[PDB]
Chains A and B, each alone.
Chain A
């Protein structure tokens, strides 16, 4: 139920959670329907996250780390302008430290597999496969949209391409980094990141 309710991550997370609750009720005073805090979610299945070498890693690989989704489109000129600054930020954040601080999960708004590959070969962080349904299920969750090709459920059109959003363990938003928002200080909003209190616990 965060940040919105009528989105498919939350519909599936609800369904799995009250089927768990009815399972434990039928097996055994149990409160129905389950609380938003008491429900549970796995954000990425076993074959979602892939790094630059195209080796898959699961969710627990991101523990103790500030994980941010990056919605982007290869042909988009905002995206083309933003990408080198994000590269520099990611670089100078994860070089000078005892350990690794942040990760960037690339979510693609592209049109074709080869366009996805060409816009992916310039990125050293992780990404999401285009034909995997997780990319547009995350689009519908976080209300990112370039133009109305999906029927909206009375949403807010939060942001367009590109965006970086700090995500939590169950898929909520921790903070929005304002590139194209109410605030719109593009190319500098990366420094608003608070990677200590934003952690994928």
Chain B
């Protein structure tokens, strides 16, 4: 007879090319806001 061939190796079908990981989660938003300045000395505040 003419029995055909299939004997494929471990690495030839096991470590195939792969879908690459979808790069995501680029977390970046902002710094928190700054509050205004309302502090004074003694001499300028009362004298």
- In the bound complex, residues from chain A placing their C-beta under 8 Å from that of B13 are none
Residues of B within 8 A of A148 (CB): 35-36, 38
**A residues 148-175 in Cβ contact with B at 8 Å:** 148, 152, 156-158
When distances are taken between beta carbons in the complex, the residues of chain B under 8 Å from A157 are 38-40
Q: Contact at A156–B36, with CB atoms within 8 Å?
A: no
Say which residue of B38, B44, B46 sits within 8 Å of A152 (CB atoms).
B38
- Most chain B C-beta atoms within 10 Å of own C-beta, residue among A152, A157, A158: A157
B interface, over-half SS: loop
Total of A-B residue pairs, C-beta within 8 Å: 16
Report A16-46 CB contacts with B as 1/0, cut-off 8 Å. 0000000000000000000000000000000
User: Interface size (B, Cβ < 8 Å)?
Assistant: 9
Kindly identify, within residues 1 to 47 of chain B, every residue whose CB is under 8 Å from any CB belonging to chain A: 35-36, 38-40, 42, 44-46
**A182 CB-CB contact with B under 8 Å:** yes
Alpha-carbon distance between A136 and B44 when the two chains are bound, in angstroms: 24
Q: How far apart are the CA atoms of A148 and B38 in the complex, in Å?
A: 9
**How long is the Cα–Cα vector from A25 to B39 in the complex, in angstroms?**
44
Residues on A with beta carbons closer than 8 Å to the beta carbon of B42: 182
A143 to nearest B CB, angstroms? 10
CB B45 to nearest CB in A, in angstroms, measures 5
Residues of A within 8 A of B35 (CB): 148
Ordered by A's residue number, 16 sampled pairs between the chains whose C-beta atoms are within 8 Å are A145-B38, A148-B35, A148-B36, A148-B38, A152-B36, A152-B38, A156-B40, A156-B44, A156-B45, A157-B38, A157-B39, A157-B40, A158-B45, A182-B42, A182-B45, A182-B46
Interface residues of A (CB under 8 A from B): 145, 148, 152, 156-158, 182
Chain B: residues with CB nearer than 8 A to chain A?
35-36, 38-40, 42, 44-46
Known: A152-B36, A152-B38. 8 other contacts (CB 8 A): A148-B36, A156-B40, A157-B38, A157-B40, A158-B45, A182-B42, A182-B45, A182-B46
